[PDB]
Amino acid sequence: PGARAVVWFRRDLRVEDNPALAAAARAAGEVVPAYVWAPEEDGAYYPGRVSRWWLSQSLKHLDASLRRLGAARLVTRRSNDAVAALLDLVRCTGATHLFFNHLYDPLSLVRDYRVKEQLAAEGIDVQSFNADLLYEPWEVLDEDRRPFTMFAPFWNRCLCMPDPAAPLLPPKRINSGDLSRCPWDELVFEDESERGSNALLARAWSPGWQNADKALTAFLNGPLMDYSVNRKKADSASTSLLSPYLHFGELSVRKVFHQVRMKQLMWSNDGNHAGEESCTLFLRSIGLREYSRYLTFNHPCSHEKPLLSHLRFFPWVVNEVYFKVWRQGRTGYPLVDAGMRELWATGWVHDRIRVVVSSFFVKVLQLPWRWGMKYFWDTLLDADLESDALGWQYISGSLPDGRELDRIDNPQFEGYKFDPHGEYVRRWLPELARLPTEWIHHPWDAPESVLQAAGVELGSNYPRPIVELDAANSRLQDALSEMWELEAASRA
Amino acid sequence: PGARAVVWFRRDLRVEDNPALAAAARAAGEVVPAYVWAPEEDGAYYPGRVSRWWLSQSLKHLDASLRRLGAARLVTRRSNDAVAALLDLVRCTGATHLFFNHLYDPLSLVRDYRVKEQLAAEGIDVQSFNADLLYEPWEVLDEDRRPFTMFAPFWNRCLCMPDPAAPLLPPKRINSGDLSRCPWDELVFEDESERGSNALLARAWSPGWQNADKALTAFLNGPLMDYSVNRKKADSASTSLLSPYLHFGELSVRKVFHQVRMKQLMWSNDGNHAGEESCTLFLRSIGLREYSRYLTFNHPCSHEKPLLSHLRFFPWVVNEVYFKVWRQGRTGYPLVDAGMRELWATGWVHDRIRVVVSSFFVKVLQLPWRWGMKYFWDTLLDADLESDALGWQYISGSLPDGRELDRIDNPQFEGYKFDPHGEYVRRWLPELARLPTEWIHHPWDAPESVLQAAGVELGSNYPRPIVELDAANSRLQDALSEMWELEAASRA
Amino acid sequence: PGARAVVWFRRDLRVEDNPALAAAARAAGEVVPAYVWAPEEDGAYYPGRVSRWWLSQSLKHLDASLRRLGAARLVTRRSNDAVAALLDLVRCTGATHLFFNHLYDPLSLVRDYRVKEQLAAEGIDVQSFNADLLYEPWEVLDEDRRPFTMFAPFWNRCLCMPDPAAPLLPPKRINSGDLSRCPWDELVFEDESERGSNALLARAWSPGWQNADKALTAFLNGPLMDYSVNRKKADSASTSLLSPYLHFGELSVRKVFHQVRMKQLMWSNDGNHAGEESCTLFLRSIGLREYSRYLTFNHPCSHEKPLLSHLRFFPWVVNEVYFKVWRQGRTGYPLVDAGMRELWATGWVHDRIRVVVSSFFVKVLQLPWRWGMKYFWDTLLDADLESDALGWQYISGSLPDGRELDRIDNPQFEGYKFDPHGEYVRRWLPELARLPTEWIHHPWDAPESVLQAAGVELGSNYPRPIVELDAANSRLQDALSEMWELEAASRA
């Protein structure tokens, strides 16, 4: 009751199960809540074109959700320096207590300490807890006090760890203080050119604290049960579609764990024997994110010692027109192309068809992986540098469990794994909507009298394949050899 | 991992959010679970005819749910002495740790201590926690350290108390020990005469750990939202139908609180302004049970100083044929009679039409309230002596907030409150299915040429009213006067 | 275009597939439509208490349906003489052409001729066609030019007869003439006492031209398919519920034949092999009505030579209290009693449980069948003297295919045929809602310690059986013997 504590959140835009919210209305009795936007010294790089578009709309949905729970306001202050914003706030607000939530990424790994040291020097009682992750990366260890180099045992230990915390209920209702009229900077998240041509994201995606709580609750009832068989299939709504919601924290990662585990229970005693297997498998898929946070917290992943050091001595072509063809739906490889048409039509693509397009980048285009990550970063809603780094490691050699860099997936039966009747291609790629599915991911291989049976005439409708696959798969093996050849040269 | 702890539950038949289960598989690594049946020295009285029928079926649904989570068995041991059964068990099981769950009733208020003292003397580490109640009755107090004499402020304080514990998730999976073959007594819950004629309960009710978890989850989606308006209406599925499930603990009382409070959240930001009011009102209705546990823990309610002391000097007629007519659907009062036909057809009746039949017992029949409670006890599934005592206090004078003993409700517009179009009567009472609803709860008052317009001919179809209301409502006031007259006589 | 023809309908209240409507707006170009109410010389007897209640509401639904198709009015004229009403109309209307629809019953068999002879004498061109029946009773004959004495071959011939006429579409839209203000008598259909206590019929039934068109269309989709198995079961919505609609003509009897036969088609090629059998069986059930019209047209059934001549020399008890117990739910026989509670609660009962109550009248009560028919006539909505005569013949000896008069059905497994789990009894008869279903139709036979297991105490709840079955089944056989004994006496 003493003063007005304040919470400042960045990737925990939710009012349910927000320890920071449950801490501020737990010492103080006046709680004003804030978000800051110092992007320049958020450091290169930024959040990307669409990761903004989402972020703006979440805030709106946080502001008018916040306002309802307790009429202040979401107080928007933009500055050159983050640390020197909460100081701008704390005098402004007239507050003695700043509470927020942890963030594990490198770019804000150090920021929190220097929002602690600079703030503790002003006797301000900065404190922050854990709502973004399920098992705190420093909470899990390795037989005697070491780390995990693979996924397998990190999860297998986590499984018979204890149960992680049930989600806290929201506060009853909260209240401001003087919205003095202290710091109302309206925020700029999108450039004015791509305002209109952004919003079609809203036709396929609907961001928000609320909208994410039902994003999950409508997954459990439906797509969950027959998920174990279909998680690989990309031609249907086979997956949670819940990842940007979980990126920004709009959905509590242990709300879900509680709910999933519950459904498993009911299904077991229901006698549904494939609901449990489906239900365990999902949990592992959430575990992948938990490991992502673990790996960046465990390994440097900062400046320089890069994530993909070990391709340092790799020779790839710096070709800026191959990349543009990749950027769009014109490579020649339909699986890659449907994915590529969807990413940039809608801002999300199935996991398994991320690998096929992201492998295709490094593997057969032999182009600098930095280029891919930026486009990914720029054009994805569910972009965390953390799990999207992990996804670039897995896919290209690195991770001891990640798949073989030396092997180029053959699209025809990597396409039967992920699109068996071939109707993923042909919701995005109707140019070839009619060529039968034997070789819908092949069109080159298939005979020239069948192409005409279904009006694909590569070079009018659907373009001939960039880099005819055989001779990149040669040249990767030579390229890998120079890697091996010149890493032992500078092992001297 | 050291030995085999054991849990013994009585009114907490559930595997989710069972601290006892989460305690035994938390010291020990072998967990066998048990239930005992010493009814003779469970003390007069028993659990009643149907409260058994439910109990048997729950166990079955606990045994084969227990078995699946971890194949032992539900170990059934019947004895003359309860205390001397766990000793029979602990040697048998070869166990060092007995954990169970609290029960607040008087009949087992003392038992737990003497399952502690006798068990602590054998160095056995008896311990037990809180899963049956939401706010522990000793956790709430009164300004300076006193108690609550009404409902109003007990809840109003509880509301801005803290949030009560989120429900614990079930254990992953558990395991026996040697089901030596140590104590398998098969249990007798129903007499063999009323076996067949019991089970129609199963057509309207379906007991079980599981069945209760979906009893709730199908309430939230449907009847919850438009509950604030309809909680009084008894002609539709206006209520949770969730009370026997919550009596035996099959549904966690703070599973529900979490879920309710959540729905309130989503509805508030949904803009549904009547979902919140509906959602708060339900919560109070759960609060009524919490107060029930509070009142019995607070006030003696034991041997003798009875719950309804203050009718001690009341003169009622000991008439055993009035009671039999009450027992069935033949009183003459249709509201009372539909309720009475339903209680004994199905084992549950709406709250608000419990008061009309339970008032009718004390008020116009002027019959010994003990008689009512036993039938209630004998014929209800959702029978706890605790809340069903509280419901007999409220209804007859006692509780400072309970309604006036001196006033006899007039059935005609107490029937419009609770059955406005009159279709509760006429699902149970079709003898008069056709007399229009102006006076469907009246039939006496209504004119003798209308009775014939709808073929009620009181004394063939639907019997003339026992004790024509006017002259019991006289005689209660005289009866109350002798109470007042002879309580001041023995205030000498 | 010449003048204003007029249509007058009595048991064809519908605007679709009404040849009379399609004839008047086919010579004339002005069409006014009318209904008359001469009940006194409609002849004893009347239409019964509820057959009115329906009739009033149909007219209302014809008047405002008529008005919409073409704003006149339904013109209501009540008179002592029917014939002298259309003369009152024709001058009034200023009309040259009166068209209506055939009615096959005896009471209006002669009326139509003397609405022809008296009207043809005034040079008025009376004409009328066929919309009430499917195969015109004079259209079907017997090998060489004879009649049918059983059902079996009447239908078997009708089956490979030709297809009967598809239903005509309604007129586009029609128009009056001067609603001069010529004959507006408002009509009296119900006595003012039983106005209010009639309408609960509206809760279970909803009469009307329109409401009947969807009464059918919602039958085909649902209850039709699994009708072949369930037509006998009375515990569910196993049947069309379409008979009063079809009595008054609100549903075209060959609209349905077309629709049924269509569904059979689609199901056959659907591969549904039980939809065809179900679909044929329904058709026979409609055939029963067609035969009814045939039998009254074929056999005198008029004044006197009564339908049940051959029980003329039968001795039954004239007891007016047995009949009153029958009238209500108090006989002692639950199957009979549920039916009896439903008839008079709602105005319709399943066919198969009509026989059990209507047999019970003649067979074990041995009471004058006239008494039953009047109550049936008075309390049924789907009352045509035509098919409800046929149903009294079939059930009591007469019809060569009707079941044996000498045999009294034993209620226990006539009740398993028609109510196998026993939940028909116990939606209407909840007094015994709890006694298990082994002997729910028996209660006498079942042991006195089970009655108490389920609180039936015959003589408080559910009354002991009138005429304990054995000794009526004796006495029918003696009664039948005196019939046989004294028919051969007056074969002298």
Add this chain to the structure above:
Amino acid sequence: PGARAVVWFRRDLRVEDNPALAAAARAAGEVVPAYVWAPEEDGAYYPGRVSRWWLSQSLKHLDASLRRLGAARLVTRRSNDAVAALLDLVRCTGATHLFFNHLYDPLSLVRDYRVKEQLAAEGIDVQSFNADLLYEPWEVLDEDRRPFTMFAPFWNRCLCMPDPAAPLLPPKRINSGDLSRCPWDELVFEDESERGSNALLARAWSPGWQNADKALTAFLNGPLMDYSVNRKKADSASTSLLSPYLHFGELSVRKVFHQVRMKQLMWSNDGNHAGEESCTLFLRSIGLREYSRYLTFNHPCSHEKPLLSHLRFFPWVVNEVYFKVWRQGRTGYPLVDAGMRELWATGWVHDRIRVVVSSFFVKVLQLPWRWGMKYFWDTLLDADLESDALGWQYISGSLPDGRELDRIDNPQFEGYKFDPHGEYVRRWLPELARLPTEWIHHPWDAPESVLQAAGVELGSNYPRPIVELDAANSRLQDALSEMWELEAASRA
């Protein structure tokens, strides 16, 4: 019963409401049914690539539907001469009576007479009736005995004509004769190259006698009611999707008229005031087909005096690469291009977006209309030369009510009429899935900094517009002038 009559159908593949079927099992008592395939002297031209694919599958669905109704067989005989096939049949079958159904097209206008003259000379009683059309083209006339030159009054008269015949019910069940083993030629409908790449038609369309009966019955319940507003909108399932079914006769054109008109009735009395307007409007849309049959029966439309005589002296460019771009989705005009991607992906496109692509052919490509019709003929399922001629007349000058040839529709607000939010484009044309809908049908006009806001880069993704619209709309007006200029030259 005398002999085996035979029916031969060509564009009436249905067993319900097939007068030919109802005629053969009405003189004869043995009925064998047949279809012939003489395509060479069916005359140029053929039926097109997909009109076959449908036709094969219908037969299959007729053969095994025929077989079930009555086990013969559909007897498939292919010949050089049609007339000399039924002679091959009639001896073969040993039959005296050949009945079929009328076809109004020119190519078989004469065939029927010379399947009559050659067959009547062999004393064979050829006869055939009317099942393909609703009002027989010789049944409607013009004030005094003339014809109709516009649609408007042809329908307005037809409306207050009489009601056309209700649909006949199928036969009960029929039977062969000796399937001697007389003429079983298996039929070739598709070339073996385009077998596989044809069938995806089956994913969007499902042909068949049966499948068409439910194609309609699921239209009435849903899309019918809100059809009056949405018939123009092409972005949803706004229309019957019932036209190929109605082309081949699989759906009876007066089954539907009956059903539609019925729904109108129920909606009127339902009070739905927009169901009637919607229901009338559909009927007119069926009327368009009726007029089509009328126009070809009325006007020569044969050899030579072509349908589009009056563009005889029109100069268009014979350019075979403009046409190929049209053939596919690459014109530059998104509305045109989505349509063009759908036609050839799926074999059907909305009516209103047929005009925009078919106008675009004649109007801005200024290419020979013959070229369009063949592709239409080749790639449509719902291809009748009859109504698809009429649709080419209407769209290009001809029909006195058809729209102005001189005016080129401006795509931007012809696209708001037909695709208001722009989601038709972007189910077929996702290359531009993201450019906002202000100018999704414009992409040229819209500014070069917005193209980049949504990654359209015309010349990588979605190609720059063939013939930049302005200067075809110039050149049509010059082209029209030479028409006018050189028709008056040869009016000399």
